[model samples]
Target chain A: SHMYAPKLQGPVAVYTWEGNQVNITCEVFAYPSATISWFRDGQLLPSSNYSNIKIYNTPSASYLEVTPDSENDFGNYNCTAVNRIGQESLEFILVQADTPSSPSIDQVEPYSSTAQVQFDEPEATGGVPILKYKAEWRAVGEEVWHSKWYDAKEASMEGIVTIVGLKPETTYAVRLAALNGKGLGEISAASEFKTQP
Target chain B: MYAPKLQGPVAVYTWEGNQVNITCEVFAYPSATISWFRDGQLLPSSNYSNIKIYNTPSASYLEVTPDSENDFGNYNCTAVNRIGQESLEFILVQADTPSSPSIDQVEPYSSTAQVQFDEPEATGGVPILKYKAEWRAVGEEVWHSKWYDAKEASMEGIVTIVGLKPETTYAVRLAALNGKGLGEISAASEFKTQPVQ
Candidate 1:
């Protein structure tokens, strides 16, 4: 008979707020059994951090609990299982939420019925990659606003979007919001522009 | 990013009272963590006195001088890194002569006798691929032999022997083989067929 390697179970990415606890598990199978070790950001996690870490083990799996400090705990974590015959490991990422800075409109090019709007990415990403950008616009005299979403992949290097179907020579209020896994950030301050006749 | 893979010997067969060295390497991005397991259980390196483990950035090693019967079994090697993990299997056995098989007569009749025998335990480091049964009349100089392929599914099941002369005393012996070849034959056991009324 021969032993099989360790395997990880559960989600690999965890999104949470600061001061919250997260649990990650390492599941594995092997001959002669295997033990678990944890690492953070490519460095071995010391036992001195044990106050914030908990570990449990069985024949088939290992469980790890971590109460991460904001900013300090938001990075890559590795969970590894080892035996005399071989070893296996898994990598997990933890991300925290931070409000993105308000975006400023770089330019507004208007046609008779449409407007091309360009903006800058938020100065801060909230410690994680932004997933998308949301834009909303409405005529100055109207109460209802129409919305458009631009996926992160669609954002130009300089961040740009086009708002279409506007009335000729109309004044419109436009706003933008940045989003990541944690959800949407505060909407940017309204930027007013007028469509050309 | 690509997952790490384990590269090393697929299996190991060692004679009883011998030393064994097994090494496995992991090739991965962001380096990899290596570990060991035995029989699907975690084998902490600190707990074993006769076993020494060496782990480096790219490779892992396990050296064992197995002195106890429990030390002989399957061992697993695992390799893991930021991207993913992999495992390889190694079988460690204390190969030697097999214990004698247990035999019993199923039916005894005037013309023929039927018998069954249990497959003996395979202590050899390698898998037992075949089994052999030999039998003859009490006074016969030549023995009749039969060989059976040891299928994994039925290797532990009972084997049947037929076509023995009725009313005659016979001697029977059983043996097992690995890739290393046949083990010691069991001592001959005797049985008698029933006479006609």
Candidate 2:
């Protein structure tokens, strides 16, 4: 049934509290199945000899469950998969991430009364995974600001937000802030859009 | 230490009555004076109550609230310093219908035909919302129409036209819609549906 060598996802990040029992998943696809091993500080991490951390395995994935007891434990965890065909390895960094960095706008499709906005993820995720984005817009130099929250459901590169309640032949300023498991990041620099008459 | 330098948008596409803001980042040592022009004539200050200009320390802006087709065309932003001068040209082109599309190929079956075509060169400064294809049999009085949705700008798909008669010859033409409106339809392309295998 195994036709390919081990292929593991790389450069993953996991965020959680230090004392909380966190489950860090290591997923891989390989032929004839693969065995997973965890290593930290260049030493093999043994499960039976230790109690705070344990590695659980299925046919295709390995789970690392741990309750961090030391500050040194909250760092890099390298996992390797060894199968009949070949092997692959990757690193998962554990940290308490802050809010995500500034998400930026890509473009806006403007109409008479509405405009569709699309934004991209920030270069730095602040060590956390973004869950959604909040977009806001207002008339230039006006007081009230309109806002909308769009979910991060795209496997694609960006998210779409359509803003309404706008008037024709008006100039508007728009910006968005990303939200991770922690909270929303700082709003990005505003972009300009104008409605058709 | 350096003379005045400027940078901003080279080409702009907007709808009529849409307030367009043209900005140029100013870089100079001893400060520079800026001015706006239309077709080599100095644009006076808010003469029509629709034009405005703002010069800041680091950037200068020319905001135009176009009211008609006459409001668009060649414009210039020039900055002059004691040392030297720099100028940038901007063309505020109005948005319009997209160019016509061309049918690349057609695969005919008993009751359906698969039509594939290339995307137009320009979508009138906007994404193609959808496409409409009109097909008529060799002797038909009225053309049959079908709609194809463009999920996004970058996503295009082959359109399948159903209700085709077996071994019938037809002519097909397509048009795309943007924020402005439907563009010119493409030149007619002919196809033939085959008998059921």
Candidate 3:
């Protein structure tokens, strides 16, 4: 490819507690390196003059670290990269995280047919004490369903569960819901798998 | 004004051909609309002839009349208001076979024995509706048994057995009735009746 604009990668939102310090990062791609800049609330951050405001750059990256401190920090952050060819910019936000996200399925194995299923923990846990992960599963096209609770502490980081009495050569679906002191969260999208003969 | 707070039944033991009232008590400022969910689908979105949902100012209830053998699982009740939403779940499991009772006292009379037993550790998550006691002479092969309503027998946990031989060595055992039928027989409590005067 010919020399291109300094391409910035992002437009993602990061979550944090109120008044907590946060570090933001972005990547820039170009033929030659690019100059990086950070902006908050639509104004360029003079930012490094203050002791707590950390802003800098490298070969292909930029970083902005600062504490919400009092009330000045809850808004959009824009990362812009300028190169000889052109310039590109992306946006991200730092706010407080809540309730996490739905857990997702990772693997479903039924070798001799225990119908063991695994799950990936939610990206965030709403910053609360986790209670348990509740699982629901059933065979394809069957009206009847079954559910069980997996203790978050006792189970592995990436959850592994064995659902007994599953039939061979059968297709089944499974989903998980997380519960914490905050409350029960959303259910993961149902994932499907087929049991081996 | 508060967000929705909810409380619901944790565990319920039920079998087919029975009906149960699953209720959720919700507390919140500014009234909320309560909705029920099962298998991740809104309950009202499906055709369920045997299920009825009722909501009051502070409570939501589900009247479930199971139509099939395995029609038991988790059901969620959600309360939503302008401010926020909250949810709780109810789990229905197969009626458990209540464990056997232990003999606490055996009151032997001339021709009748009054047996008193302690409640089992588990009540199948429901009340023991019926109780049966059986007795036989120490050397006899045949056993005589009688059934008593839990209400009548539960005065300080007492179940009486009548029609016994005088001054005879007898072996007595008890069995509890779950909703569907009888459960395991307890170990025999042997005693001797008073001699005929």
Candidate 4:
């Protein structure tokens, strides 16, 4: 005889993008079979939410689809399975990006005494607007880094910074940092470029 | 800063001759590149006949129509970003219940009868654990069941019923059990022992 309590399966933490489809599936197994239900932040979801749910009876799996996820969707979502024998539940926490990602250096143009470094914005904006960027450059053998700051309003804008008073044909390393409401994020990896002779 | 997390189906169970589709996706601070591999071998774009693999901006999908035993294996989906990379494995399990077995009377003596049966369809998912047989006189309210260890026989064996009345008729049926559980029982049929000579 098959007899056991309901068991649920899926991830404990889920990461998603805003306005993107988020699908979470929980598979439940029981002897006499079980009924599946969804909850958000400890409140049971009503039948009105069933429109976004898909249930598979054979293997007893439930898929909760959130089309165009919104801020309200980023919370503790639970899947509960109940049967005559027993009941069980699983939780998934949906999260969004919260910090600016490391920037990528795209191109470097060098003159006799200066170099122009162009880079792309960080992949993530920390769920907020980027206010400004900080650029730093230093000669390959020097321990001191020269820093400059630029103001920007949109994350889509490319970052370009010019470094002057460099030794001719000398290699210099450069990096960038993004500032958001959460404060300054991590700096990008150092990229090296040589000045024209 | 880029933090990558890979998510997808943990396992898939299907019977032979059935088609299966597995999907994998990744979420990270920075957008990551996704790839598909089977048992460490990269899957390229082409029709392998039994398998078709697709990679999209957000997810990777693998479809398999296994034609033979060699088509089943572990599939790995990988995602890579500038910060790091992660991989998730999907186990493909070929599972189905054994078919109904046919039984016949091998020896029908005065007070005993020997019965034999061929192995039903191959066990799916997991190997067969044991086989069971039930017998009873026609229109009887009670039935007698006998179990045979799968280790003792190659899923096909014979059983003898003693203490039977000479020239009496009984209904016999057979069934199989695997790790998953007991499968459908064979249809009951009439069998009679010979009269005392």
Candidate 5:
């Protein structure tokens, strides 16, 4: 007769604003199966939370699912399994969310002496009154990009931003971005145009 | 009569499965052209689906359809005019999504109750289809409950809850989720199981 053990698949990553759900599957490799239990910070949880924690009389595997993900849920989630032969535990980190997307250029206007462009910031889930914004811009049609940060409080309500310092009678492209603690949002569309020659 | 013109470059970045546009402009520039180049190579006119450029006289300019993270990198712009050429470069950086996941519905789940949740339009460019169900017995600490990892097809479907302790009061929370993560928990759903003799 052999014992069964529990195994963790991987850590689940999710966003911040909301909670999340994940599934942890356990396999008992011993004869007469094993008893599987879930613990958070060393505290045993009830069984009703998932499919029955079956003590397989035969070789069997059980799975526990996590759902509707959450930020706080990101942690060392452990699954414990025990059988006559041995016991095993597995751990993983659940990434709730990462940095948000950035803003992007939506339009550009090139004049004979200068250039102008409009951009839309990225949209984020956490509506906690955006603290700040990061917008990056450049003018080298074949060079590198530059960046800067803006105060959210100072941003216009229309979600539109303008940039200056462009050469006239030339062409340029522009981009914009929005950012916060959690991360940035999706960038808006890109726009391009040539200045008056 | 001449307008005091501004000149600058365009910034770029990548996020949320797409490209971001951030442009720099000086005060008032006459006509300007904004174009895009990849690795110093001009993006072909045929690749309009990923990068789109727009320019308007009303200080409106930007990329209509920006590229994705894959297309992000060194970007340069050339603002040219009868006087001279102003060049700017921007380094496109990839940004992550925000932390906070949207939460909805604060309700209770009985032995036979359906769970409903609000769907986010942009869940990694796809709809989310997962839920984490949690319950706390009256006078007990918050307990981890079950999870549902369903597909888009299973959404708006019925889920049956069995093995409830009769005559017991329980508090349950349901969270809506997608690939981004779980949203807010629905209003706490409180219910009492039928008395079991």
Candidate 6:
């Protein structure tokens, strides 16, 4: 009743950090079990790229999976199901690890003994891996001050750095930094903070 | 007389969100006002989706922010001094975002497989407020495999059920019903079973 054609399964979604095992699945139905091929932007993916892009057949439908995701894995992938009627394709995109960029100070709050510094995340755009964040501080006119960094994989923004052991009513310079495999991005512009007397 | 040429590798930094600023040093007999351009397009001062460019006479600073994908391109700074005019070009790169994900491949976990399609994230579009998944065997009559009420799945696309004989092939199809009626069924697809252990 229908012309020879291959039908693709609908959309699929998955989220993961770097080095996490991930799986994406699709189902196809056609006459005489259509030949299925895996591709990224029309390029045939070698089975070695994953556990062997798997193809399983059954009475009703077949399954496809391409694995061992890498950074370049973040683009449109196609699954072609072909039969006498015709050939059809489905597309998928994988998210890659984020690259670290130069960082900056978004805002700063100061008190007599404690100050809070808000900084812009260099990798917040997406795909950038953020294991931890480090914040450092120094007195405005002196060479000897203190420094500290914070864990920020979970909370990329909206964190606090308490400049403990500070002199009341003293002006200080503060900076925030982020690091990843690519290396440290730009540091935040220096901000002057005067502790409450 | 000719104006001295601007140097190479001029660095422009992007601030939080979408803002950029740069400072370049040059030597000229008669210093002149400087203007920056991107890909031959005049850079706007503000509210430009592609980029924003500004200048400070005292500091000889050139600042800009280029938003949107098209805004990324070669940037050139031209200084018009009383002696003459000089220009320098720099490449500007932008960050990436997670694009919508689609199905690339499918494999039979068991045998006969059933698949459905839906949205997993919030996007602009009429609420696919309602929908259904259709299927047919290699030789059997076509049938509606499942009907999904928006209430149950909420925000998810694509579902697959498996159980079929090994080495057999199958055909599948899906139709999305919405306020506008059945939008369209994805093209049908076919899959063959692999040898079982």
Which predicted model would earn the best TM-score?
A: 3
Q: Model 2: per-residue lDDT, tens digit, B1-197? A: 33565656687666666555666656554678888888666866545566677555545667676788988887898888887777889898888879987788888888888888887788787446567888999988889997765542124457888888888899988888754678889889898889766
Candidate 4: stretches off by over 4 Å: A41-60, A67-70, A100-173, A176-196, B1-21, B26-71, B74-197
TM-score of chain B in each prediction: 0.51, 0.72, 0.89, 0.53, 0.41, 0.38
Off by over 4 Å in 6: A1-4, A9-35, A40-44, A47-77, A91-96, A100-104, A119-124, A128-132, A141-147, A151-163, A178-185, B1-197
lDDT measured at residue A76 in model 6 versus the true structure, 0 to 100 = 64
TM-score of each: 0.33, 0.43, 0.48, 0.41, 0.27, 0.37
Q: lDDT per residue, candidate 1, A15-80, as tens digits?
A: 555554445546453445677788875556645544466665443345556666657767677888
Candidates' C-alpha lDDT: 0.65, 0.72, 0.70, 0.68, 0.46, 0.52
Against the true structure, candidate 5 reaches a TM-score of 0.27
Judge candidate 2 against the unseen true structure and give its global Cα lDDT, from 0 to 1.
Answer: 0.72
Candidate 5 residue spans exceeding 4 A from truth? A1-95, A102-104, A109-116, A125-131, A182-190, B1-197
Tens-place lDDT digits, model 2, residues A151-187:
5544124467778889899999999888754578889
Please report how far candidate 2 places residue A51 from its true position, in Å.
40
Residue-level lDDT of model 4, residues B72-167, one tens digit each, is: 768888877887777788988766777776675456677776778776766555445567888887767678887765544442477766677778
Per-prediction fnat values?
0.00, 0.00, 0.00, 0.00, 0.00, 0.00
Instruction: In angstroms, give how far residue B104 of model 3 lies from its true place.
Output: 2.5
How is the predicted docking of candidate 5 categorized under the CAPRI scheme? incorrect
Q: CA shift at B116, candidate 4, in angstroms?
A: 43
Q: Which ten residues in a row have the lowest lDDT in candidate 2 chain B?
A: B148-157
Error (Å) of candidate 5 at residue B165 is: 29
Q: Per-prediction TM-score, chain A only?
A: 0.57, 0.58, 0.49, 0.51, 0.43, 0.56
Residue A169 lDDT, candidate 1, scale 0-100: 78
Write down the RMSD of all candidates, one decimal each.
Answer: 20.2, 26.0, 28.5, 14.2, 22.9, 22.4
Alpha carbon lDDT at A162, candidate 2: 77
Question: In angstroms, how far off is A92's CA in candidate 4?
Answer: 1.7
Question: How good is the docking of model 5, as DockQ?
Answer: 0.01
